[PDB]
């Protein structure tokens, strides 16, 4: 059923599974009109579909042309997400298709179930975890490809860089969620922590800097301090 803190190691077993996060699919800026009314302008978005065991991220870029002439866009966005995830599954070889898809928001359950009726053996599940995947657009290389897109496009990334050569997928997911939670809580400070030292660079083929094992421990500590610092600022603690 639902995926929570009791069954957390299930994410790193050998049954193929994908998280689907739709929080950046339909993105707008709200603005005033010449007459003083309010209107929205869409900007390019993305579906965040991630295999937490391998780091495999299928970033389907949602170009603003998708929304042209359509009504009820926040509702449509859920069905468009489900349509695209269904199309991704069908594009994968049978032995690569997931056995479970975990949606980060419960409103995606019915759209995805309906689009996946042809796959009765793929379980569609919610989660009780509060995952920070909305912050994916705070990763500079991901935001760059989304904003530059001029048409619908799928881009592939290992979101763990080469970390799995040195750490387990449980630890890599923990590092990812800590980084994303930090970027969500205070984007400017998190990017300062990650890029403050000019001698540590991001490889051309990577998303995150090339930290040594000991440097990652320092970075991880600085991210936890940031999250706690912001918590105290928010609640006056």
């Amino acid at each position: 059923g639902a995926m929570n803190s009791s069954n957390y190691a299930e994410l790193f077993n050998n049954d193929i599974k994908l998280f689907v996060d739709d929080t950046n699919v339909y993105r707008v800026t709200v603005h005033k009109t010449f007459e003083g009314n309010v209107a929205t302008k869409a900007i390019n978005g993305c579906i965040f579909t991630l295999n937490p065991k391998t780091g495999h991220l299928f970033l389907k870029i949602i170009h603003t042309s998708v929304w042209a002439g359509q009504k009820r866009l926040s509702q449509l966005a859920k069905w468009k997400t489900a349509e695209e995830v269904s199309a991704l599954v069908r594009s994968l070889p049978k032995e690569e298709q997931p056995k479970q898809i975990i949606v980060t928001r419960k409103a995606m359950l019915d759209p995805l179930e309906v689009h996946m009726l042809d796959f009765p053996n793929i379980a569609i599940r919610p989660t009780e975890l509060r995952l920070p995947f909305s912050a994916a657009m705070s990763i500079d290389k991901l935001s760059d490809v989304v904003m530059k897109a001029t048409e619908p496009q799928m881009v592939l990334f290992n979101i763990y860089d080469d970390w799995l050569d040195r750490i387990s997928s449980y630890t890599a997911f923990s590092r990812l969620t800590l980084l994303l939670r930090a970027l969500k809580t205070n984007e400017e400070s998190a990017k300062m922590i990650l890029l403050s030292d000019p001698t540590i660079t991001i490889k051309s083929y990577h998303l995150w800097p090339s930290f040594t094992d000991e440097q990652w421990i320092t970075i991880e500590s600085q991210m936890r301090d940031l999250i706690l610092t912001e918590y105290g600022r928010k609640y006056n603690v």
């Binding site: 449509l76 069905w79 019915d110 759209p111 689009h115 009726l117 042809d118």
Partner: protein, 300 residues
């Protein structure tokens, strides 16, 4: 007017006939029900005094044969049987009538309740939902499961209602996933009406039969079917006007007849609130909405 005689009444029992009921004492000289209106199906139903478990009963049409009730002490229930000897039957009824051992079907002349509840219900359609081809009448009880309930266990004792499932390939055209899920008109009009039921009269007949089995037997699967068939119409943006007007009449009389104290168990809050206040047809069921708001405002 027709008659269903009883051989005897050996166990104390509450007997229903359509929307009426009466109590018979153990070994009371009760020998049946007379003056049953010709032209409608009827249901004769039982709840034993010493074990209210299992309400059970029989749907029948006196135009199709001469039927009587006799208690079976081995199986422990009142059984309907058909008498093929026409002259024996007439002679039996006449003696019981002369001795005044029968209750009269107590229909008030002004009262169209039973017609309004069974307008589209036909025995031939009942006999396809309830499969026992050697009899002209159909047994139903409180515990019988539906074909759909069995898919989610004896097949011969099942209620073969038409399966309705909103998240099924039958309900959802490939490529129209959002459209068909949010507006069920395709599933209602093409799949169910044109395809399976052939016309709205058969659809309403099954809806009405499901309601009556829910009400008279407490049959849970029948209640599920009744609500599904309502929801399917209310969740469709395109419904013929004559069907919406007839549905409003059907539901009005169902809600009017429901025991006030059985509302908690026979009415689904989600379906009714969705149907009356959110669905495409929220403004199409004027009579039903008025009776629901005056009779069961708590549910809403």
């Amino acid at each position: 007017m027709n008659t269903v005689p009883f051989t005897s009444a050996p166990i104390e029992v509450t007997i229903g006939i359509d929307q009426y009921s009466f109590n018979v004492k153990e070994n009371q000289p009760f020998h049946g029900i007379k003056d049953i209106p010709i032209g409608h199906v009827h249901v004769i139903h039982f709840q034993h005094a010493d074990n209210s478990s299992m309400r059970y009963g029989y749907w029948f049409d006196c135009r199709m044969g001469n039927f009587y009730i006799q208690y079976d002490p081995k199986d422990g229930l009142y059984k309907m049987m058909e008498e093929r000897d026409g002259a024996k039957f007439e002679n039996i009824v006449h003696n019981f009538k002369e001795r005044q051992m029968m209750v009269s079907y107590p229909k008030i002349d002004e009262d169209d309740t039973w017609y309004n509840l069974t307008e589209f219900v036909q025995m031939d359609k009942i006999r396809k939902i309830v499969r026992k081809d050697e009899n002209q009448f159909s047994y139903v009880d409180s515990s019988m499961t539906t074909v759909q309930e069995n898919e989610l266990s004896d097949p011969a004792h099942s209620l073969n209602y038409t399966v309705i499932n909103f998240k099924s390939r039958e309900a959802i055209r490939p490529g129209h996933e959002m459209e068909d899920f949010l507006d069920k008109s395709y599933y209602l009009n093409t799949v169910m009406l044109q395809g399976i039921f052939k016309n709205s009269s058969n659809y309403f007949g099954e809806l009405q039969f499901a309601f009556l089995n829910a009400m008279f037997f407490g049959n849970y699967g029948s209640s599920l079917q009744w609500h599904a068939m309502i929801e399917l119409i209310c969740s469709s943006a395109t419904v013929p006007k004559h069907m919406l007007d007839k549905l409003d009449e059907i539901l009005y009389y169902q809600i009017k007849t429901l025991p006030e104290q059985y509302s908690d168990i026979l009415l689904n809050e989600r379906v009714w609130n969705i149907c009356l206040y959110s669905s495409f047809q929220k403004n199409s069921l004027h009579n039903t909405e008025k009776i629901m708001e005056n009779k069961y405002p708590e549910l809403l």
